[PDB]
Design an enzyme around this catalytic site. Sequence first.
Site, PDB file in Angstrom:
ATOM      1  NE  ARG A 194     -88.314  43.895  69.561  1.00 54.24           N
ATOM      2  CZ  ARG A 194     -89.452  43.299  69.193  1.00 54.24           C
ATOM      3  NH1 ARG A 194     -89.823  42.140  69.732  1.00 54.24           N
ATOM      4  NH2 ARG A 194     -90.272  43.879  68.313  1.00 54.24           N
ATOM      5  CG  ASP A 234     -93.860  50.414  59.200  1.00 51.56           C
ATOM      6  OD1 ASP A 234     -94.421  49.531  58.507  1.00 51.56           O
ATOM      7  OD2 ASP A 234     -94.202  50.707  60.367  1.00 51.56           O
ATOM      8  CE1 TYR A 276     -92.873  53.361  64.131  1.00 53.61           C
ATOM      9  CE2 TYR A 276     -94.768  52.997  62.729  1.00 53.61           C
ATOM     10  CZ  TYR A 276     -93.468  52.684  63.094  1.00 53.61           C
ATOM     11  OH  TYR A 276     -92.796  51.692  62.399  1.00 53.61           O
TER      12      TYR A 276
HETATM   13  N1  NAP Z   1     -90.842  44.573  64.611  1.00 49.77           N
HETATM   14  C1  NAP Z   1     -91.574  44.852  63.505  1.00 49.77           C
HETATM   15  O1  NAP Z   1     -92.482  44.106  63.191  1.00 49.77           O
HETATM   16  C2  NAP Z   1     -91.296  46.056  62.660  1.00 49.77           C
HETATM   17  C3  NAP Z   1     -92.252  46.426  61.693  1.00 49.77           C
HETATM   18  C4  NAP Z   1     -91.998  47.542  60.907  1.00 49.77           C
HETATM   19  C5  NAP Z   1     -90.840  48.281  61.059  1.00 49.77           C
HETATM   20  N2  NAP Z   1     -89.916  47.900  61.995  1.00 49.77           N
HETATM   21  C6  NAP Z   1     -88.736  48.748  62.186  1.00 49.77           C
HETATM   22  O2  NAP Z   1     -87.557  47.966  62.323  1.00 49.77           O
HETATM   23  C7  NAP Z   1     -86.710  48.539  63.347  1.00 49.77           C
HETATM   24  C8  NAP Z   1     -86.469  47.461  64.396  1.00 49.77           C
HETATM   25  O3  NAP Z   1     -87.695  47.048  64.964  1.00 49.77           O
HETATM   26  P1  NAP Z   1     -87.741  46.359  66.427  1.00 49.77           P
HETATM   27  O4  NAP Z   1     -89.094  45.820  66.630  1.00 49.77           O
HETATM   28  O5  NAP Z   1     -86.538  45.465  66.685  1.00 49.77           O
HETATM   29  O6  NAP Z   1     -87.577  47.663  67.314  1.00 49.77           O
HETATM   30  P2  NAP Z   1     -87.869  47.881  68.891  1.00 49.77           P
HETATM   31  O7  NAP Z   1     -87.482  46.604  69.624  1.00 49.77           O
HETATM   32  O8  NAP Z   1     -89.246  48.420  69.102  1.00 49.77           O
HETATM   33  O9  NAP Z   1     -86.881  49.080  69.214  1.00 49.77           O
HETATM   34  C9  NAP Z   1     -85.492  48.911  68.950  1.00 49.77           C
HETATM   35  C10 NAP Z   1     -84.689  49.697  69.965  1.00 49.77           C
HETATM   36  O10 NAP Z   1     -84.948  51.087  69.786  1.00 49.77           O
HETATM   37  C11 NAP Z   1     -84.352  51.729  70.869  1.00 49.77           C
HETATM   38  N3  NAP Z   1     -85.016  52.968  71.266  1.00 49.77           N
HETATM   39  C12 NAP Z   1     -86.330  53.180  71.570  1.00 49.77           C
HETATM   40  N4  NAP Z   1     -86.494  54.426  72.034  1.00 49.77           N
HETATM   41  C13 NAP Z   1     -85.275  55.016  72.034  1.00 49.77           C
HETATM   42  C14 NAP Z   1     -84.741  56.310  72.439  1.00 49.77           C
HETATM   43  N5  NAP Z   1     -85.538  57.271  72.921  1.00 49.77           N
HETATM   44  N6  NAP Z   1     -83.428  56.514  72.290  1.00 49.77           N
HETATM   45  C15 NAP Z   1     -82.615  55.576  71.794  1.00 49.77           C
HETATM   46  N7  NAP Z   1     -83.002  54.360  71.423  1.00 49.77           N
HETATM   47  C16 NAP Z   1     -84.310  54.044  71.550  1.00 49.77           C
HETATM   48  C17 NAP Z   1     -84.503  50.725  72.049  1.00 49.77           C
HETATM   49  O11 NAP Z   1     -83.222  50.557  72.710  1.00 49.77           O
HETATM   50  P3  NAP Z   1     -83.052  50.066  74.270  1.00 49.77           P
HETATM   51  O12 NAP Z   1     -83.748  48.779  74.332  1.00 49.77           O
HETATM   52  O13 NAP Z   1     -81.545  49.973  74.469  1.00 49.77           O
HETATM   53  O14 NAP Z   1     -83.658  51.080  75.145  1.00 49.77           O
HETATM   54  C18 NAP Z   1     -84.994  49.431  71.426  1.00 49.77           C
HETATM   55  O15 NAP Z   1     -84.333  48.223  71.880  1.00 49.77           O
HETATM   56  C19 NAP Z   1     -87.415  49.776  63.873  1.00 49.77           C
HETATM   57  O16 NAP Z   1     -86.956  50.929  63.178  1.00 49.77           O
HETATM   58  C20 NAP Z   1     -88.854  49.511  63.495  1.00 49.77           C
HETATM   59  O17 NAP Z   1     -89.629  50.708  63.350  1.00 49.77           O
HETATM   60  C21 NAP Z   1     -90.151  46.825  62.785  1.00 49.77           C
HETATM   61  C1  KM5 Z   2     -97.033  44.424  62.830  1.00 50.58           C
HETATM   62  C2  KM5 Z   2     -96.219  45.557  63.425  1.00 50.58           C
HETATM   63  N1  KM5 Z   2     -96.173  45.404  64.907  1.00 50.58           N
HETATM   64  C3  KM5 Z   2     -94.912  44.769  65.399  1.00 50.58           C
HETATM   65  C4  KM5 Z   2     -93.953  45.749  65.853  1.00 50.58           C
HETATM   66  C5  KM5 Z   2     -93.207  45.525  67.029  1.00 50.58           C
HETATM   67  N2  KM5 Z   2     -92.256  46.432  67.484  1.00 50.58           N
HETATM   68  C6  KM5 Z   2     -92.053  47.536  66.735  1.00 50.58           C
HETATM   69  N3  KM5 Z   2     -91.119  48.441  67.151  1.00 50.58           N
HETATM   70  C7  KM5 Z   2     -90.890  49.562  66.440  1.00 50.58           C
HETATM   71  N4  KM5 Z   2     -89.979  50.406  66.864  1.00 50.58           N
HETATM   72  N5  KM5 Z   2     -91.538  49.821  65.286  1.00 50.58           N
HETATM   73  C8  KM5 Z   2     -92.497  48.965  64.827  1.00 50.58           C
HETATM   74  N6  KM5 Z   2     -93.142  49.209  63.674  1.00 50.58           N
HETATM   75  C9  KM5 Z   2     -92.765  47.765  65.541  1.00 50.58           C
HETATM   76  N7  KM5 Z   2     -93.697  46.864  65.119  1.00 50.58           N
HETATM   77  C10 KM5 Z   2     -97.137  45.916  65.734  1.00 50.58           C
HETATM   78  C11 KM5 Z   2     -98.287  46.612  65.290  1.00 50.58           C
HETATM   79  C12 KM5 Z   2     -99.206  47.146  66.207  1.00 50.58           C
HETATM   80  C13 KM5 Z   2     -99.033  47.030  67.600  1.00 50.58           C
HETATM   81  C14 KM5 Z   2     -99.955  47.590  68.520  1.00 50.58           C
HETATM   82  O1  KM5 Z   2    -101.146  47.409  68.274  1.00 50.58           O
HETATM   83  N8  KM5 Z   2     -99.565  48.346  69.610  1.00 50.58           N
HETATM   84  C15 KM5 Z   2    -100.612  48.926  70.518  1.00 50.58           C
HETATM   85  C16 KM5 Z   2    -100.155  49.177  71.973  1.00 50.58           C
HETATM   86  C17 KM5 Z   2     -98.644  49.338  72.096  1.00 50.58           C
HETATM   87  C18 KM5 Z   2     -98.288  50.366  73.179  1.00 50.58           C
HETATM   88  O2  KM5 Z   2     -97.116  50.563  73.493  1.00 50.58           O
HETATM   89  O3  KM5 Z   2     -99.337  51.030  73.735  1.00 50.58           O
HETATM   90  C19 KM5 Z   2     -98.817  51.984  74.667  1.00 50.58           C
HETATM   91  C20 KM5 Z   2     -98.124  49.826  70.832  1.00 50.58           C
HETATM   92  C21 KM5 Z   2     -98.145  48.661  69.968  1.00 50.58           C
HETATM   93  C22 KM5 Z   2     -97.906  46.354  68.026  1.00 50.58           C
HETATM   94  C23 KM5 Z   2     -96.994  45.825  67.120  1.00 50.58           C
END
Ligand code: NAP
Ligand code: KM5
Lengths: 247, 247, 231, 248
Positions: free
Chosen positions: A13, A140, A153
């Site tokens: 990702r 975020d 969070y």
């Molecule tokens: N996706 C979005 O829309 C979004 C929105 C706002 C902010 N962000 C921020 O952007 C960053 C990347 O987002 P993403 O969606 O790619 O993240 P993600 O897939 O939810 O998480 C990234 C990685 O975090 C690692 N992680 C989770 N729990 C952990 C633990 N206890 N110890 C060590 N590593 C751990 C996992 O590694 P493993 O898979 O190796 O276990 C996972 O692959 C994050 O900081 C997120 O908060 C993302």
């Molecule tokens: C628009 C932002 N987004 C995408 C997304 C996707 N992955 C993300 N990973 C991390 N580490 N941090 C984030 N901010 C993040 N954000 C979102 C925003 C909201 C949601 C949501 O409603 N849920 C509800 C149920 C899920 C769960 O694990 O329940 C146990 C948690 C996620 C999911 C994704």
Amino acid sequence: EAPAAVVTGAAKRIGRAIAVKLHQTGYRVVIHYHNSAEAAVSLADELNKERSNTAVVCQADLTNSNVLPASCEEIINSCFRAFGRCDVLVNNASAFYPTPLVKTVETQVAELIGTNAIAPFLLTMSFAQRQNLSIVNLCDAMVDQPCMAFSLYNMGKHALVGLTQSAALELAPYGIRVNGVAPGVSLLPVAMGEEEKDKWRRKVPLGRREASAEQIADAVIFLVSGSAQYITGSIIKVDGGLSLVHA
Amino acid sequence: EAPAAVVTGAAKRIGRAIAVKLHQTGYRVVIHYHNSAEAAVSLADELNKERSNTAVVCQADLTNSNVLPASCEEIINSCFRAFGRCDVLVNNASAFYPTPLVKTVETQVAELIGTNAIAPFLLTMSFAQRQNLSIVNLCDAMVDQPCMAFSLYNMGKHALVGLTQSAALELAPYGIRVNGVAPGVSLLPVAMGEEEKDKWRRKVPLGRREASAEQIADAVIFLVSGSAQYITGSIIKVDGGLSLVHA
Amino acid sequence: EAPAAVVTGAAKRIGRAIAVKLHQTGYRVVIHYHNSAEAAVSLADELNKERSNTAVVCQADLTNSNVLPASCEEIINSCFRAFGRCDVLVNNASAFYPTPLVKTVETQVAELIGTNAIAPFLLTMSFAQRQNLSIVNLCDAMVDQPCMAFSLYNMGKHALVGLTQSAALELAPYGIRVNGVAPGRRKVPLGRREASAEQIADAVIFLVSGSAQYITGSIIKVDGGLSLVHA
Amino acid sequence: EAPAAVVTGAAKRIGRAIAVKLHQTGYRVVIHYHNSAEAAVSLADELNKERSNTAVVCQADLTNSNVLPASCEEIINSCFRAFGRCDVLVNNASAFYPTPLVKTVETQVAELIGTNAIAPFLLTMSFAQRQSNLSIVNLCDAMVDQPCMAFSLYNMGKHALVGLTQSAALELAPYGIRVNGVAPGVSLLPVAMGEEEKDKWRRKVPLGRREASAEQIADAVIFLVSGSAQYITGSIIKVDGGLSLVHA
Ligand SMILES: NC(=O)c1ccc[n+]([C@@H]2O[C@H](COP(=O)([O-])OP(=O)(O)OC[C@H]3O[C@@H](n4cnc5c(N)ncnc54)[C@H](OP(=O)(O)O)[C@@H]3O)[C@@H](O)[C@H]2O)c1
Ligand SMILES: CCN(Cc1cnc2nc(N)nc(N)c2n1)c1ccc(C(=O)N2CCC(C(=O)OC)CC2)cc1
Ligand SMILES: NC(=O)c1ccc[n+]([C@@H]2O[C@H](COP(=O)([O-])OP(=O)(O)OC[C@H]3O[C@@H](n4cnc5c(N)ncnc54)[C@H](OP(=O)(O)O)[C@@H]3O)[C@@H](O)[C@H]2O)c1
Ligand SMILES: NC(=O)c1ccc[n+]([C@@H]2O[C@H](COP(=O)([O-])OP(=O)(O)OC[C@H]3O[C@@H](n4cnc5c(N)ncnc54)[C@H](OP(=O)(O)O)[C@@H]3O)[C@@H](O)[C@H]2O)c1
Ligand SMILES: NC(=O)c1ccc[n+]([C@@H]2O[C@H](COP(=O)([O-])OP(=O)(O)OC[C@H]3O[C@@H](n4cnc5c(N)ncnc54)[C@H](OP(=O)(O)O)[C@@H]3O)[C@@H](O)[C@H]2O)c1
Ligand SMILES: CCN(Cc1cnc2nc(N)nc(N)c2n1)c1ccc(C(=O)N2CCC(C(=O)OC)CC2)cc1
Ligand SMILES: CCN(Cc1cnc2nc(N)nc(N)c2n1)c1ccc(C(=O)N2CCC(C(=O)OC)CC2)cc1
């Protein structure tokens, strides 16, 4: 020689895209991972096929605990062990799930506040102590309009803003810049259904779509570059205008 | 029947003034304390002399740990056992000391993040689960221009902002308002040399003086009153303009 | 082929550095000026020596008045006339002086609010109406810790934040991004490095590039950390 | 002696609620108005019936122009003329309408930026120059960073008002003049807005799914002018029921 970067949570990702783009820019990379061993190893193999001896994996749990400082020290140490230097740290790893106000709650605290804030802090300490140096924290864009029932969070991500600013101030005399990149809607969860993904996409003013991982990585690349050498303490939203949209 | 409030860290200084003003407004109070038993008891005895059976004390460490959720549940329960209700929670207790990036670090995390953020979160949970209801969090007007070498403290106060906002959103359907009061320079440490106190005082545009504890308390009284019935998620600076002053 | 940019206040200092970097990136440029014709033409001469017919100048007073909307329409039109397109607008021109609460005050309003906020608004309208498109507004990193006795200046820079955000929202459906760069020595955390106009230009170059294609409504502080430093 | 306050745009709605509550608190009040003469006089009559010689009206256009400084000076002077003092200024009057990016535009600038920003600035100047618990309260907008589509000039004006609030708080602190804001989210909807459209806005508000009453907005103004806010300057209190915390 080539600079070196640590990227946490880099197997998949956004973290993966960051690691790839840093490698393409000429960095050697430490691919940190927790559970995603196969993906981390596959990524390291891909990057090493492009340039030998430029990628290693490093496993760690970033949940808070009394051993977290040692784990974070070891991640930084792993970059020095492999590459002899550590120029960039990207705090990307993140736990994310709801914690309604109305796993034990202390486990949730440890995971959510550990990964999003305490581990970044400890990694920052170890990065600075071990020394164009910079740190980029994945923030975020929605931190002040948070998702319902995501208190812990959101607390973690607010704490990360505070770390970004505090560390920028304190590490400036050491030549270490500290900045953030704040996605809005980027890559949606694999387990999320299409309808629910589309609900999120439709909120975004610029294109009605989520940011690609590569778009987020582009902002990280800017911040670590020579073109950002007077930038510290700044958090760049990469959100397509989402944070500007009222209820 | 008179309403009831919990004030954390209420034995001295700002918390004491908040407890006194709430009592003067007609609240029964739980005076939470950690180490300051004599002062907590002295305050309770003063308030009960004023009106019998209107103040009790409750001892607890608010450092994060495995037992913190139970401790926070017990603080809220103490208000219900004494007074049959709990209308107001004031999260005032706070650890404050530097943690330079360059006690073990995990103890510092537990104390600084626990008192400033996790305990407020757990208290919030317990307050809400047990139900003009409101919560007031003691924030920091300088949270985005932090003191050098105070990263963990600053992280904790940022997390508290996030809690204030998240909890305001989530608890609004239950009629519970959640707000903050953000001092700038208020009561300084007694042992701080007057020459150092004066350096802080001279920074303040409005009167070149620190806020009294009573002036901070006045903002808490407003926020819990009927005159703030539509206010939730707001953080009121009580800082004399300090946060507007550039370097 | 080549994209085109308008830079206001481009004859000197930050605007000049922005115009130079855009040009080095491959843009054709309109160099706006009010009083600095000699310097505007000297810059155009330098840029045209590198690539013929890639820089023109455009005179306008950006003070608010009855004629400001037409003046702003002409700036944008000059880009279309010279280059057949207008991809980027950089709202750089600014007036800066104190206006104590305790020139007439209305002239100060016209200059400070007009140059710093109204002209950016009118230029934004004209840019959007005539349509990787984007606008970059030169903001102030210290907008919430203002200089003493600079009320009208600060008011105009706040208004420019509002424009940046409002226009990002409204122009998103047209594919026009709208962002800001906010410039800010012993007090500067990164004070070991001298502040330069080129550093500000680097942030502009990032924001107009394809590496910022998802970024709109964002204001990047380029201040060496100064805004984080308490009193 | 009773203190005195100027409230701009005080004939109706939130400005009237502020004038009423200040009067109930013991202030003498200048009810400024532009076009709503009947409503302004009706209010002054009610207040003077409660306590004689405690309310006057003052008419002025607050659109920007080369006479606006004289008009603003005259509003402050009217308070001194009636009551011999001016303790509080509430900048409430406000033009509000869309100005899409894609009346002349210069008239729109003069009205939107004049009423929301320039007039508050000039009134602040005049209030300070003419000079204990002195303060100014500016009526801001809780949605200033999540603006309504096609309202750029209005939003620019309200942003400028935030900047004034902060700048004036710093500069006037040595004179003992506090400067603060109250930022409504959804309060009184327009008289001409249809009920269905009003309900669209009400349904967004976390706290009660309803708009703020005019009195609820006035309550925050009353706190900020009071002795209970003596150390508060440069603060903007949202009175929004959580609206500004709600994502898209
Ligand atoms: N996706 C979005 O829309 C979004 C929105 C706002 C902010 N962000 C921020 O952007 C960053 C990347 O987002 P993403 O969606 O790619 O993240 P993600 O897939 O939810 O998480 C990234 C990685 O975090 C690692 N992680 C989770 N729990 C952990 C633990 N206890 N110890 C060590 N590593 C751990 C996992 O590694 P493993 O898979 O190796 O276990 C996972 O692959 C994050 O900081 C997120 O908060 C993302
Ligand atoms: C628009 C932002 N987004 C995408 C997304 C996707 N992955 C993300 N990973 C991390 N580490 N941090 C984030 N901010 C993040 N954000 C979102 C925003 C909201 C949601 C949501 O409603 N849920 C509800 C149920 C899920 C769960 O694990 O329940 C146990 C948690 C996620 C999911 C994704
Ligand atoms: N003073 C200022 O200028 C200032 C400035 C900005 C913000 N604030 C905020 O305003 C609030 C009050 O400030 P203050 O100066 O009055 O606070 P303080 O005196 O530093 O601390 C208040 C109380 O917190 C309790 N506390 C500390 N660690 C604890 C722990 N581990 N467990 C439980 N309780 C603990 C202590 O109780 P015991 O004494 O019983 O042990 C202490 O008396 C705080 O939230 C502070 O951050 C104050
Ligand atoms: N310099 C800093 O440290 C700093 C700090 C914060 C923000 N900024 C912002 O960054 C941008 C550039 O700063 P700078 O210091 O390079 O600006 P500057 O030199 O002070 O002004 C830039 C140009 O604006 C033009 N200008 C001024 N008044 C005008 C009017 N009434 N009509 C038309 N043009 C007018 C002038 O053009 P002519 O010479 O052709 O008349 C001037 O050369 C500005 O938006 C500024 O507010 C700069
Ligand atoms: N209502 C809301 O939900 C809401 C939301 C956010 C912010 N606010 C802010 O709160 C304040 C009060 O809101 P409101 O809805 O009560 O305001 P409003 O009814 O829209 O306007 C208040 C008064 O402004 C005066 N005004 C308009 N243009 C003027 C001009 N050119 N010169 C002088 N006065 C002028 C009018 O006076 P006359 O009638 O005498 O002509 C009008 O009665 C305003 O600052 C507003 O922006 C309100
Ligand atoms: C101007 C803000 N202020 C007053 C103050 C006083 N007490 C405070 N208590 C809490 N919990 N939180 C606060 N923000 C707080 N602030 C300040 C600001 C700075 C300082 C300071 O230099 N130090 C360094 C050495 C001190 C010590 O020996 O440990 C107690 C730790 C604090 C002390 C007081
Ligand atoms: C939720 C905030 N609110 C209530 C409200 C009602 N009156 C207001 N008056 C002033 N001065 N300022 C305000 N912010 C204000 N706000 C709103 C929010 C939005 C609207 C809206 O859609 N329109 C579109 C049609 C109207 C018009 O064309 O007038 C010529 C302009 C206003 C109306 C009212």
